[PDB]
Amino acid sequence: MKTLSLQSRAQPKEIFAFARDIDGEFVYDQKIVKDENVSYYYLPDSKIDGSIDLQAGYAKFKKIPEEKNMSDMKCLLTALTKYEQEHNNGEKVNVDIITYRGLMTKLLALPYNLNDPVDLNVLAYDGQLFINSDEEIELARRKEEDEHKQQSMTPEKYDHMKRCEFSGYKFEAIATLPKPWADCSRQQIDKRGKKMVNNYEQYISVIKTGIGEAKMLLAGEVDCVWDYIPEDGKDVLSHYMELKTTRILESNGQVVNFEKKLFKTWAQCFLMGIRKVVYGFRDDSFFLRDVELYKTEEIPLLIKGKINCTTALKWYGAVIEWLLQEIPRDDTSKAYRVSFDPSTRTFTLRELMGNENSRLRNGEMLTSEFKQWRESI
Amino acid sequence: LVPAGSHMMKTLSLQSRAKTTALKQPKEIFAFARDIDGEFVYDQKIVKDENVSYYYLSIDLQAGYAKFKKIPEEKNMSDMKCLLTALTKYEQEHNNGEKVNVDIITYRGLMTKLLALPYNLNDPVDLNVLAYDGQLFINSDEEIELARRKEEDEHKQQSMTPEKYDHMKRCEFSGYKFEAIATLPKPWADCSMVNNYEQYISVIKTGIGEAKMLLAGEVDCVWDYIDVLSHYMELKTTRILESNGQVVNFEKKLFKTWAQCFLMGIRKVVYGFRDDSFFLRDVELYKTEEIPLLIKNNALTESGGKINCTTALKWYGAVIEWLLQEIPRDDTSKAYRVSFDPSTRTFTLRELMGNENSRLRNGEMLTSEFKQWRESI
């Protein structure tokens, strides 16, 4: 086991996308993903008047079982395989690390969320590091946390919490359209507040980026398009936006808690090259009362221990460099666990058992089809 | 344990839309005709001198119904053979022995089905497509068409009274009767039973986006004299507009008429309006270019929903661009099926097996005469 002191200090572009459909199946064709799997922002000021009910339709929420909603490296590799075959001249993508934005967000946000655990699996294959959350650990963590909530909250509060979760998806539904306005039917526009809401559908952008000298492929869910998707398909990232919801702010204490969320939102968007985020603010009856659009670049200054985004990024840089330094890049006989333990506040890198390596390399992280592809090159 | 889709099939989103592009001006390059005896006429002088009608216009549109000379519908399917016969003659005699300079060769009616699709989601489409001599040839499928009309007819017997079934046949006759009573066989100065054998077919060069296309289409009459397209006119009939429901019925027809005329560069359309007793009560002249605004300004309604001609055209542009992108132009070893399935609302492109390819290339679509000609160039 190796240990990285917490005191350690060191232009994104989308290259492909994929989606999960309403039935939980994955969609890989680039054209169809762009044509019918990403929505467009539409929320006129006239409707931010307190009439929009973000808990309406809760009972028919189509919710994916959490066991099928963990970060999945397999679909990422399936999409990557297609990209390499069809758009990278049959060559492997030129990065050092392949992972999900949400996992990197956990690393970036760590210095100011020392109460949150982190557990990541890392393994070297074909000269690249593949990083994902651990299925077993994650599933158990989610189960434990929900069971704890059910047990420690009144029935009313627990149901209220579930409705808050729902309201985020509901906000996305009532603040977006499936196509540009000019290509929508009147029914598609006028009847969005009644449309069934689901969390099966996801649009996943995969970007090439990096930090310091590290090159990274990062996959992340994107909520919508702010204006349009460039016809020539260039610099599409700058056209995306995130959509969040939170409670109205009625006191100083609530504002400080909002800054903590803002930090996490900055981390998510910054890593992904997303330049805009809209927050919807709702009351305890779930009515939409205010909306605010933030530029990602200004969030650090809207935030006023003491959160420092620069320090966070220097820490993140140090973690990434450390992994690249400490994990033998061409040794495929081992797998590693990167862990942050909140009870001792230690950030650790350890070698997993051979059988854990076997599990990861033969299904959980790497797929047979991806390995066969990379072998064939 | 069954694939979600065939590995030999690709899907186009119904939401796909091309950017609006410059209007293309169609131009006639040759014509051919089918005579009263059902024989084809290819000589340009003879076709123009003997096979063209001229507009000239109580009147009972079901009169003479008893003698309607109706060609057997299985002898009236769109025929690539006659088109290729006419095209060969054109290439030999007027194009300096070179192939016509287009990407796609097909019939107007088939393209109309694609253009009108967004507002006709219950109507199936099935087209055969194949690459030959650097060009795509597109026709309906003979067997599918045969089965489909019979299927629909059985469905009618099964759902209609003998009288209403009879009423539907008289409605069909009334259109041909209107043409007969509203035209002369020659210009007035030379004029000293109803049938659907006689057809005058204009073949035009046109385009959409970057695609160049040859389209063959029946033309009803000349409005003044033989830029020949600008001298043609379409003739249609429909029931008088005595209720909102009839306005609904008319709008669907008027949109299809716009699509047909727009694609062919026909600039004028006359509708005859008839009552229950099939008396002609009103006649209205339209310019094709004014139809989209008439439809837009109609409060009554029916991308599904309100018909929008611009949206239709953007869909059509997307379809044509997609076909040209997805079907290898220089591979003559394969044939394709383009299909819209109303039950699933999916638009797909599927590679046919070798024996279907052979059937199309060796008689049904390509003729031996046409292939020998193109080879000799």
Author numbering:
A (entry chain B): 2 to 11, 18 to 311, 322 to 394
B (entry chain A): -6 to 50, 58 to 192, 203 to 236, 242 to 317, 320 to 394
Q: What are the paper's exact sentences on this?
A:
Rai1 homologs share several highly conserved sequence motifs, and our structural studies show that they are located in the active site region, mediating the binding of the divalent metal ions and/or the RNA. We have found substantial variations in the activity profiles of the Rai1 homologs, and discovered that some of them possess a new 5′ triphosphonucleotide hydrolase (TPH) activity. The overall structures of CaRai1, AgRai1 and SsRai1 are similar to those of SpRai1 (16), KlDxo1 (18), and MmDXO. Each structure contains two mixed β-sheets that are surrounded by α-helices.
The CaRai1 and SsRai1 structures are especially similar, consistent with the 58% sequence identity between them. The αC helix is absent in AgRai1 but contains more than four turns in CaRai1 and SsRai1, which also have a longer αD helix. Therefore, AgRai1, CgRai1 and SsRai1 have a distinct 5′ triphosphonucleotide hydrolase (TPH) activity and do not have PPH activity. AgRai1 again showed strong activity, while consistently weaker activity was observed for SsRai1. At the same time, there are substantial differences in the positions of the helices, the connecting loops and even some of the β-strands among some of the structures, and these differences are especially pronounced for the β4-αA loop, αC and αD helices and the connecting loop, which form one wall of the active site pocket.
